[PDB]
Design a protein around this ligand. Structure first.
Ligand SMILES: Nc1nc2c(ncn2[C@@H]2O[C@H](COP(=O)(O)OP(=O)(O)OP(=O)(O)O)[C@@H](O)[C@H]2O)c(=O)[nH]1
Ligand SMILES: Nc1nc2c(ncn2[C@@H]2O[C@H](COP(=O)(O)OP(=O)(O)OP(=O)(O)O)[C@@H](O)[C@H]2O)c(=O)[nH]1
Ligand SMILES: Nc1nc2c(ncn2[C@@H]2O[C@H](COP(=O)(O)OP(=O)(O)O)[C@@H](O)[C@H]2O)c(=O)[nH]1
Ligand SMILES: Nc1nc2c(ncn2[C@@H]2O[C@H](COP(=O)(O)OP(=O)(O)O)[C@@H](O)[C@H]2O)c(=O)[nH]1
Lengths: 428, 50, 56, 52, 440, 428, 434
C-alpha cells in the first residue's frame, strides 16, 4: 500500500490542485460533502492513496494548501469541491510574496515553512508506506517559486527516499505574466535540479494550442486549462490506485524515464482529446491514441520535439484492451521516426497498462517524455535572464531581502550546466 | 444562485421546444380539419398555384 | 420562475417520437459517467462452470 | 482583429459553439432524468416546512 | 485581512478621495450614511469590503483613509456634504492656516502642529489593521499642502514603517497648462526628498485627462469632478484584485516589484480603457484586443508624454470584468509584434497581467456601463522629456532668484534649492543611462 | 465569411443610403433601436455582410457617412432608422460643399479625407475577408462627386483586391438640378473609368417613369424614389446574405458581368412591379418577371436597349421557383431579341436565384445590364460638356480653387475614349 | 474492403452529393442521424463505422465558399456528417479557373489532402475516388483540377472517376463557363481515369417528358443524378450474379487510353402514376437507354458509333433476359458499332431492387445504368470549342483570368489539347481500311 501527499503552494498551484481534487473526487466517487457515493468497489479498494479515512465515512484529501497571500486559497475553499479539505492543512500567513523569489525563500516564507513542515510531518505518520510527494506550482512568479522550492529542499533532506514529482508552470515564449519571471524561474530551476526526481513542464501557450486547435474552444478558461493538468497528473498515478496488467508506480516511472540524475526534466501529454462537435464521430482506438500522443501538437510544453531527440518515453495506458496494439504501435512509431529517437538507448518506450478508464472516457493514455527539445526552454530562459542581469535591473528588490550577486551567478551557471548535457546527448 | 439562474434558463428553453412542437402539431391538425369541413361546405382554401 | 417549474408540464404529446431520429433530444449519450469498471481478471477469469456457492 | 461574433451568428467558431450549447442542454436534461438537478433540490423541505 | 490605508493630502488629494470613496461605497453597496441595506452580494460579503471599509457593532462601515489638509473649507465641504455621517470626525484632519502654495510652509514651519496628530491617526488605523498591504498616497506636485506635508509624511512613515509599501498617485505639473508659478519650485523640491522614500509613484496629469474628456467622453465644458472621477476609476482598477477574485490575483506589493527596476526610477505612467461616454460605447466592439490597443494608442495616456519619444521599461495590465486570458494573450502578442511599441533590450519579459472577475460599476455620471476594462501602467523613459522641461522651468525661474525670499525666510536654507536641482540632474542622468541598448 | 463596407457621400448619397439601411434593417429584422427582432433564424444567417455588432446583440451598420454640410448629417441622425449608426462614423466638417468638384476634390473636400480614410481603415481592418466597398453618391454636383472620386482613388490604392460598387445617380436629359452637372459628371466618370470595378448608373427620369408607367402613383417624392434604389441595392447583394441554389456574390457578378475593364457601367432594375390597382389582376410568375426585366419601361437608367446591343445581362432572382422556367425564359429572351444581343459572347446572360424573397413579396428579382446603350448617357454628357467648355463658362471657380486647364481636356478625352469602345463593340 | 471515397467540389457537387447521401442512407438502412435502426457488410462501402453504432460517410464536402456546406451542416443531415471534412473557405471562387486553382487553392488544398489521407487511413482496399463537380463555376473547375494534380501525385495507383456536370449547350448559367470547362478538361484529361458527363438540358427534357415534371428544380435533377450513382456503384454494395467493381470499369470501358468519356443513362425514369400501363420488361429497360431521348447529354447517338457499353442491371432480372435483349439490340441498324469491337457489351447483374426516396421517382423491380463511350461526344466538345473560339477571338473576359495567375498560353494549350482530342475521336471512329 503506497501513498502520495499532494502539497501545493501559490495561486497557480492552489487552482491546479483544486481542479485536481475535483477530477480525482470524480474518478473515485466522492461528492463535495466528503462522503463516498460510488458504484463499484474498485474505487474504494485503493481509496487510501489520496484520501484519508475519518469517522462517519468522511474522506479528507491528503492535500497541503499553502499560500503567503490568503486570497485565492480562500477561493479554493469557496470552490465547488471546497467543503472536503481539512481546516488544519490550510496553512497561510499575513504577507505577500510580491512575485519575488527572495521574498519567498529568505523572508517570511521561511517563517511559514516551519508550520508547513509541521502539517506535512503530522500527515506523514498517518501512513504505512508513503511513496512520496507532489508539488504543483508556478516557476514564474512568487510564493510557489521560492517557498515551493524551499519546501522541496527541506522535505528532500527530511525524507530522502521518497519520490518527488513537481508539476511546474514554466515561463512562456510569447507573453510573460510577470516581468521578473526570468529571475524567479531560473532561481527556482537552480533548486529544482539537485532535489526533484520527476519534473513536468506545463506551458500555458501549449495549453492554448491544445485548447484552440484540438479541443476547439472559443472561451478557454483556466478551469479547463488546469483541468488538462489535472487529467495528466491523475493519469501518471493510475496503477497506484487501480489494478491492471503491468502496473506502474512513480519510482517505476522515474527509473524508466531518467537517464541521469540531473536529466529529469520531462514534457507531458494527455491525449484522448477530441472536440465537442467531433466527439461522437471519434473512433477511439490504440493507433489513433498513439498518433494523437506522439504528434508534436498535443504537448503540454512549448517546445517542439521535432528539433530534438527523445531520450526516454513512457505511455501510461488505461482501459480494457489487447495490449499488443500498444506494443506494435510503440515499435511502429519507433521505426517510423528514428531520427527523433536516440540510438544509444534502445527500446526506449515504457508501456504501463491499467484496467480502469477515466470516469467518462473509454480508453486513455498519458505521455511522459524526456526530450532534448527541453533545451529550447532553458536557452530562452537563459537569454531572458542574462539580458536583464547584464544591466543589473529589477534586482535591488532581490538584494534587499538578503541575497547577493553570486547566487544569481551560481543559478545561471547551474542552469547552463543543464544546457550542456542534454545538448551533448542530442549530439551524441 | 448563479448556476440556479442558468438552470432556469435551460428549463425555459426546454419547455419552449416541447411547447413549440405541440403547437405546431395542433396547428397542422386544425388546418387539416378546417380544409375538410370547408370541402364539405363547398369551398376551399387558396394555396399559391394549388 | 422558481415556483412554476412543477407547474410547467413537460410530458405532453409532441408527436415527434420519444427517442430515435427526430425526437427533441437524446437521453443516454448525455452523461454516461458510469465507467467500464470491469477488470481483465474479473472478465476472463470468471467461474468457468457454474457451481453451488458452498463450513461448520 | 475580428468582429467577435455572437450566438446564432454563423461567422466564426459557431459550429463548436452550437455543439457546446447542445451539450449543455443535453447534460441539463440528463440531470432532469436522474432528478439531482438544482431546480428542485430543496423543494421537499422548501415547501414541506412552509405549508400553512 | 488584506487591507490598505489611503492617505489624501491637500485640496487635490481630499477630492481625489471624495469621488474615490463615492465609487468605493457604490462598489461595495455601502449607503452614504454608513450602513449597508443587505448583505449576500458579491461586493459586500466580507473579504471585498474589509480592504477599505472597517466594521462596527451597529453596522457602521468606517473608512480606512486620512483626509488631511492644512487649511479648512475643503474638509468642511466633505463633512458638510452627503458623506458627513460616513467619515469619522477625526478621520478628516484640518489645519487653520493655508500652506500658501509654498513648499517651505508645507514642510518646515507649519507641519509640526499637525504631523503628530496625523501620525497618531495613522497609528490608530494601522493598529486596527491585520494585514497592512500599504499606503496609497494621493496628492499633487503643485500647491503647498500636497508638496510639503507629503514630503514630511513619507519621511515619517519611512522612519516608523520602513518595510511597508507606498504607492503615490501624483498630480504631476502639466506640460503647458499649470495653475501656479511656483509649481516648478514645489514639484522639484518635493520629488527630491520623496524620491528616496516613495516606493512607486504613478503620475497622472491634468491636460491629458482634459484631452481624454474632450476627445472620448464628448464633453466640451467639464469640471474637476469629471476630471478626477477617472482617477477614482484608476485606483479602483489598481486596488481591486485583492478585493475580489479573478484569474490572476495581482497584489499591491507586486506593482512595485514589476514596475520599478531601479531604486530611484519608480515613476510609472497611467492610462485607462473604456473612457467612452454611454451614447457611443454601444456602437463599438470593446473587445479585449481593442481595449488593449486603446491603452497603447499614443493619445489615451493620462499624462501628456509621448511614448514614441522613448522606450518602455515595464508595463502592467489590470484587466477587469468578463475578460478571457486567451484573448489577453492574443492582444499582448499583437502589441509586442509591431514596432512603435519599442521595448528596451534588457527586459523582453516586460508585461504583467492581473485579471479580476468583477465588472466595473458605473457611478451616476458620465462614464459608460461596460463589462470590460483595463488599466495600464508603463514605466518608460519618455518621462525624461517632462523632467528635463521641468528642470528648464526651474533653471529659468532660479537664475535670478524669483520667489526665493518666501521660501528662505520661512525656515528653509538656500542650499536646498541647489541640492534639489542636482538631484534632478542625477535623475535625468539615470534616465538617459537606462535608455540606450546594451553593447557589452 | 464576407463583408461589405457602405460608404455614403453627399446629400443624395446620405438620403439614399439611409433609406437603404431602413430597407436592409426591415429585411434582416433589426428594429430602429438596433436590437434584433426577427421571425426566422435564417435572417441572422449572414448578418455580418452589412452589420457589425456591439455589446448585447446591438447591430451597428458598417457605414461611413461623409459630407461637407453638417445638416444632412443631422437629417440622417433624426431619421427613423437614425440612432443605429456609429456616432464616430458621422464624419462631418464645418465647411461648404458648393456643388463644386474642385472644392470637393483639391481642397476642403480633401482636408477631411484623412479622417474618412482613418474610419474606413479601422472598419476594413476589423474584418477577416472583406469583399469590398459600396459608395452611394451623386454623379453631378459636389461632395459625392468631388470627395467621392478621391475616396474611390485612395481606397483603391490601399485595397487593390476588393470589389468597388458605386451606386451613382447620373444627370438626367430632361431636367438638371445643377448647372455644372456636365462638368462634375465628366470629371467624376474620368476617375470612375480607371478605379472602381462596377458602377450602377441610376438616372432620375428613368427612375421615375417607373412611377408612372408601372406604379401609377400621382405624387411620389424622393422618399418614394430612393426605395427602388434601395430595393436594387438589396437585390444585388442577396446571394451572399441569404442561401439559395446557384449562389452569386459581387465578384462573381463582376467577372461574369464586366467583359473589358473599362466597360463596367451598368443599368439596374427591379421587376416584380405593378400599380396598386393592378396588383390583384397580375399573374406573378417567372416568365412575367423576365418580361418585366426586359421591357424598356422598368429600368432606372435613361438608355434605350433598342438603341444598342447588350453585352452582358445579369439576373438575380429571389423567391422559391423552378430552374427550367428561368433557364428557358432567358434563353427565349436571347432568341427573341437576337439582334439586340451580341454574337461574340454566346450566352451573354448570367442567371442566379436565391431562396427567401423580400418580405411583402413572393418572388422578386434584380436586373443588371451592360449594353452599348450607355453611350447615349456618356455622349450627352460629352456634348453638354463641350457646349459649356468652348466658351470657358462656369470654370473660373475651378481655376481659382486650384484646378488647371489641361486635365479638363484629359477628362473630355477620356470621355470620348470611353465612347469609342462602346461604339466599336456595337459593330464588333 | 470494397470501399470508395467521394470528394464533392463546388456547389453542384455538394448538392448532388446531398441527394446522393439522401438516397444512400435510406438504401442501406441508416436514419439521417447516422444510427442504423437495426432490428450487413454492405454498410462498409460508403459508410465507415464508429463505436456505438453510428455510420459516418466516406465523403469530403469541400467548397471554396460557405453557405452551401452550411445548408448541409444546419439541415436535416447535420448529425450524419463529420464536421472536419465539411471544409469551407471564406471567399467565393467567382467563376474563375485562376481563382479556383492558384490564389485560394493553397489555403485549402493542404486541409483537403489531409482529410483525404485521414479518411484513407481507416480503409483496407481503396477501390477508387468518386468526385462530384461541374465544368461551370470556379470552385468546381479549379479546385477539382488541383485535386487531380495532388491525388495523381499521392495516390497514382488508384482509380478515380469523375461524375461531372457538362455545360448546357442551349441555356447554361454563366458567361465564362466555356472558359472554365475547356480549361479544367485540358488540365484533367491526363489525370481522370474515367469522366461521366451529365447535362442539365437532358435532365430537364427527361423530367418534362418521362417524369412529366413541367417545372423541375435542382433537387430533382441531383436526385436523378444520384440514381445514376447508386446504380453504378451497387455491385460492390450488394451481391448478385455478375458483380463489377470499379476495376472492371477501368478495364472494359476504354479501348484507347485518352478516350475515357462514357455517357451514362437510366431506365424506369417513369413518373409514379404512369407505368401501370406497360410491363417495364427487360426489353423496355434495354431499349430505353439506347433510345435517343434518355441520353443524359445532348449528343445525337445516331451521329456516332458506340465503342463499348456496360449495362448494370439491378433488381429481379434473369440473365437470360439480358442476353435475349442484347440479341434484339445487336440487329438494329441504327445502333451502329465500330468494326474493331465485335463484343461490345459488359453485363452486370445485381439482386436487389432500387429503393425509393419520398419524391418523384417510383420504386420498380428492374433498373439499369448504361455506360456507352460513343463517338458522338465529339459534337458536344465541338460546341464548347466553337463557343471558346468566338469568346477568344477578341480576348473577352481574359483579364480576370490573366491578372490573377494565368499565363496567356494556357488558353492555347487547352485549344491544342481539345483539337487533339477531336482528332483522336475521329481517328478512333474511322473504320479500318488496312
Ligand atoms: N479632481 C480634482 N483635481 C484637482 C482639484 N484641485 C486641484 N486639482 C489639481 O491639483 C493641483 C493643485 O492642487 P493642490 O496642490 O492640492 O493645492 P493646495 O495643495 O491646496 O495648495 P494651496 O491651497 O494653494 O496652498 C492643480 O494643479 C490641479 O491640477 C480638484 O479639486 N479636483
Ligand atoms: N444538380 C445541381 N447542379 C448544379 C447546382 N448548382 C450548380 N449546378 C451546375 O453547375 C453550374 C455552375 O455552378 P458550379 O459550377 O457548381 O459553381 P461552383 O462550383 O460552386 O463554383 P463558384 O461559382 O465559383 O462558386 C451550373 O451551370 C449548373 O448546371 C446544384 O445545386 N445542383
Ligand atoms: N494552468 C493554470 N495556470 C495558472 C492558473 N493560475 C495562474 N496560473 C499561472 O501562474 C502564473 C502566475 O502565478 P503567481 O503570480 O506566481 O501566483 P503565486 O504563486 O501565488 O504568486 C501565471 O503565469 C499563470 O500562467 C490556473 O488556474 N491554471
Ligand atoms: N434617388 C434619390 N436622388 C436624390 C435624392 N436626393 C437628391 N438626389 C439627387 O441628387 C442630385 C444632386 O445631389 P448633390 O447636389 O450632388 O448633393 P451634394 O453632393 O450634397 O451636393 C439631384 O439631381 C437629385 O436628383 C434622394 O433622396 N433620392
Amino acid at each position: 500500500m503506497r501513498e502520495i501527499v499532494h502539497l501545493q503552494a501559490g495561486q497557480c498551484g492552489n487552482q491546479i490542485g483544486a481542479k485536481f481534487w475535483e477530477v480525482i473526487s470524480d474518478e473515485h466517487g466522492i461528492d463535495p460533502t466528503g462522503t463516498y457515493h460510488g458504484d463499484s468497489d474498485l474505487q474504494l479498494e485503493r481509496i487510501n492513496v489520496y484520501y484519508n479515512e475519518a469517522t462517519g465515512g468522511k474522506y479528507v484529501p491528503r492535500a497541503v494548501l499553502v499560500d503567503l497571500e490568503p486570497g485565492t486559497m480562500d477561493s479554493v475553499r469557496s470552490g465547488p469541491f471546497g467543503q472536503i479539505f481539512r481546516p488544519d492543512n490550510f496553512v497561510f500567513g499575513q504577507s505577500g510574496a510580491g512575485n519575488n523569489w527572495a521574498k519567498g525563500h529568505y523572508t517570511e516564507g521561511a517563517e511559514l515553512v516551519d508550520s508547513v513542515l509541521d502539517v506535512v510531518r503530522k500527515e506523514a505518520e498517518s501512513c504505512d508506506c508513503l511513496q512520496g510527494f507532489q508539488l504543483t506550482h508556478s516557476l514564474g512568479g512568487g510564493t510557489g517559486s521560492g517557498m515551493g522550492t524551499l519546501l522541496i529542499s527541506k522535505i528532500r533532506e527530511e525524507y530522502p527516499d521518497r519520490i518527488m514529482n513537481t508539476f511546474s508552470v514554466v515561463p512562456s515564449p510569447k507573453v510573460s505574466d510577470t516581468v521578473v519571471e526570468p529571475y524567479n524561474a531560473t532561481l527556482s530551476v537552480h533548486q529544482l535540479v539537485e532535489n526533484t526526481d520527476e519534473t513536468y513542464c506545463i506551458d500555458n501557450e501549449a495549453l492554448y494550442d491544445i485548447c484552440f486547435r484540438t479541443l476547439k474552444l472559443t472561451t478557454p478558461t483556466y478551469g479547463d486549462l488546469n483541468h488538462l493538468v489535472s487529467a495528466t497528473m491523475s493519469g501518471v498515478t493510475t496503477c497506484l490506485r487501480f489494478p491492471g496488467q503491468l502496473n506502474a508506480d512513480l519510482r517505476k516511472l522515474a527509473v524508466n524515464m531518467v537517464p541521469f540524475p540531473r536529466l529529469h526534466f520531462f514534457m507531458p501529454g494527455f491525449a484522448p482529446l477530441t472536440s465537442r462537435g467531433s466527439q461522437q464521430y471519434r473512433a477511439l482506438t490504440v493507433p489513433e491514441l498513439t498518433q494523437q500522443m506522439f504528434d508534436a501538437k498535443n504537448m503540454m510544453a512549448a517546445c517542439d520535439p521535432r528539433h530534438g531527440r527523445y531520450l526516454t518515453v513512457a505511455a501510461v495506458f488505461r482501459g480494457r484492451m489487447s495490449m499488443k496494439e500498444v506494443d506494435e504501435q510503440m515499435l511502429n512509431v519507433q521505426n517510423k521516426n528514428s531520427s527523433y529517437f536516440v540510438e544509444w538507448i534502445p527500446n526506449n518506450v515504457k508501456t504501463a497498462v491499467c484496467d480502469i478508464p477515466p470516469r467518462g472516457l473509454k480508453m486513455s493514455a498519458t505521455f511522459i517524455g524526456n526530450s532534448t527539445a527541453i533545451q529550447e526552454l532553458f536557452k530562452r530562459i537563459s537569454e531572458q535572464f542574462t539580458a536583464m542581469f547584464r544591466r543589473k535591473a529589477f534586482l535591488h528588490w532581490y538584494t534587499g531581502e538578503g541575497m547577493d550577486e553570486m547566487e544569481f551567478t551560481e543559478a545561471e551557471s547551474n542552469m547552463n550546466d543543464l544546457g550542456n548535457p542534454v545538448v551533448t546527448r542530442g549530439a551524441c | 444562485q448563479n448556476t440556479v439562474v442558468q438552470e432556469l434558463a435551460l428549463a425555459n428553453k426546454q419547455l419552449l421546444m416541447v411547447r413549440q412542437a405541440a403547437l405546431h402539431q395542433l396547428f397542422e391538425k386544425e388546418h387539416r380539419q378546417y380544409q375538410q369541413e370547408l370541402n364539405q361546405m363547398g369551398k376551399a382554401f387558396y394555396v399559391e398555384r394549388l | 420562475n422558481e415556483e412554476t417549474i412543477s407547474s410547467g408540464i413537460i410530458e405532453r404529446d409532441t408527436g415527434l417520437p420519444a427517442t430515435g431520429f427526430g425526437a427533441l433530444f437524446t437521453k443516454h449519450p448525455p452523461d454516461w459517467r458510469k465507467m467500464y469498471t470491469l477488470t481483465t481478471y474479473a472478465e476472463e477469469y470468471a467461474p468457468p462452470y457454474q457451481y453451488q456457492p458452498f463450513p461448520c | 482583429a475580428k468582429n467577435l461574433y455572437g450566438p446564432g451568428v454563423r461567422m466564426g467558431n459557431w459550429n463548436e459553439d452550437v455543439y457546446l450549447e447542445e451539450e449543455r442542454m443535453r447534460d441539463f436534461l440528463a440531470k432532469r432524468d436522474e432528478g439531482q438537478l438544482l431546480i428542485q433540490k430543496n423543494r421537499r423541505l422548501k415547501e414541506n416546512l412552509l405549508r400553512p | 485581512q488584506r487591507e490598505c490605508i489611503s492617505v489624501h493630502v491637500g485640496q487635490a488629494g481630499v477630492q481625489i478621495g471624495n469621488a474615490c470613496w463615492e465609487l468605493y461605497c457604490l462598489e461595495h453597496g455601502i449607503q452614504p450614511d454608513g450602513q449597508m441595506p443587505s448583505d449576500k452580494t458579491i461586493g459586500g460579503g466580507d473579504d471585498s469590503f474589509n480592504t477599505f471599509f472597517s466594521e462596527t457593532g451597529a453596522g457602521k462601515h468606517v473608512p480606512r483613509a486620512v483626509f488631511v489638509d492644512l487649511e479648512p473649507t475643503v474638509i468642511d465641504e466633505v463633512r458638510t456634504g452627503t458623506y458627513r455621517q460616513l467619515f469619522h470626525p477625526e478621520q478628516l484632519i484640518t489645519g487653520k492656516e493655508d500652506a500658501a502654495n509654498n513648499y517651505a510652509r508645507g514642510h518646515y514651519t507649519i507641519g509640526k502642529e499637525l504631523i503628530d496628530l496625523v501620525l497618531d491617526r495613522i497609528r490608530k488605523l494601522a493598529d486596527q489593521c491585520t494585514g497592512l498591504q500599504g499606503f496609497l498616497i494621493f496628492h499633487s506636485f503643485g500647491g503647498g499642502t500636497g508638496s510639503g506635508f507629503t514630503s514630511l509624511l513619507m519621511e515619517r512613515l519611512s522612519v516608523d514603517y520602513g518595510k511597508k509599501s507606498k504607492l503615490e498617485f501624483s498630480i504631476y505639473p502639466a506640460p503647458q497648462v499649470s495653475t501656479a508659478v511656483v509649481e516648478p519650485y514645489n514639484s522639484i523640491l518635493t520629488t527630491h526628498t520623496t524620491l528616496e522614500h516613495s516606493d512607486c509613484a504613478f503620475m497622472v496629469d491634468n491636460e491629458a485627462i482634459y484631452d481624454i474628456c474632450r476627445r472620448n467622453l464628448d464633453i466640451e465644458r467639464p469640471t474637476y469632478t469629471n476630471l478626477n472621477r477617472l482617477i477614482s476609476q484608476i485606483v479602483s482598477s489598481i486596488t481591486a484584485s485583492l478585493r475580489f477574485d479573478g484569474a490572476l490575483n495581482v497584489d499591491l506589493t507586486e506593482f512595485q516589484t514589476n514596475l520599478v527596476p531601479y531604486p530611484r526610477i519608480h515613476f510609472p505612467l497611467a492610462t485607462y480603457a473604456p473612457v467612452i461616454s454611454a451614447e457611443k460605447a454601444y456602437h463599438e466592439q470593446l473587445s479585449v484586443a481593442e481595449i488593449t490597443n486603446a491603452c497603447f494608442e499614443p493619445a489615451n495616456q493620462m499624462v501628456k508624454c509621448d511614448p514614441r519619444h522613448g522606450k518602455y521599461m515595464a508595463c502592467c495590465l489590470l484587466y477587469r470584468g468578463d475578460v478571457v486570458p486567451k484573448d489577453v494573450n492574443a492582444a499582448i502578442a499583437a502589441i509586442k509584434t509591431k514596432r512603435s511599441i519599442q521595448f528596451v533590450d534588457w527586459c523582453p519579459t516586460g508585461f504583467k497581467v492581473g485579471i479580476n472577475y468583477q465588472p466595473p460599476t458605473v457611478v451616476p455620471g458620465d462614464l459608460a456601463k461596460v463589462q470590460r476594462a483595463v488599466c495600464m501602467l508603463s514605466n518608460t523613459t519618455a518621462i525624461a522629456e517632462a523632467w528635463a522641461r521641468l528642470d528648464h522651468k526651474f533653471d529659468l525661474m532660479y537664475a535670478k532668484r524669483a520667489f526665493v525670499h518666501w521660501y528662505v525666510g520661512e525656515g528653509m536654507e538656500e542650499g536646498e534649492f541647489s541640492e534639489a536641482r542636482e538631484d534632478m540632474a542625477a535623475l535625468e542622468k539615470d534616465y538617459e543611462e537606462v535608455g540606450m541598448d546594451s553593447v557589452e
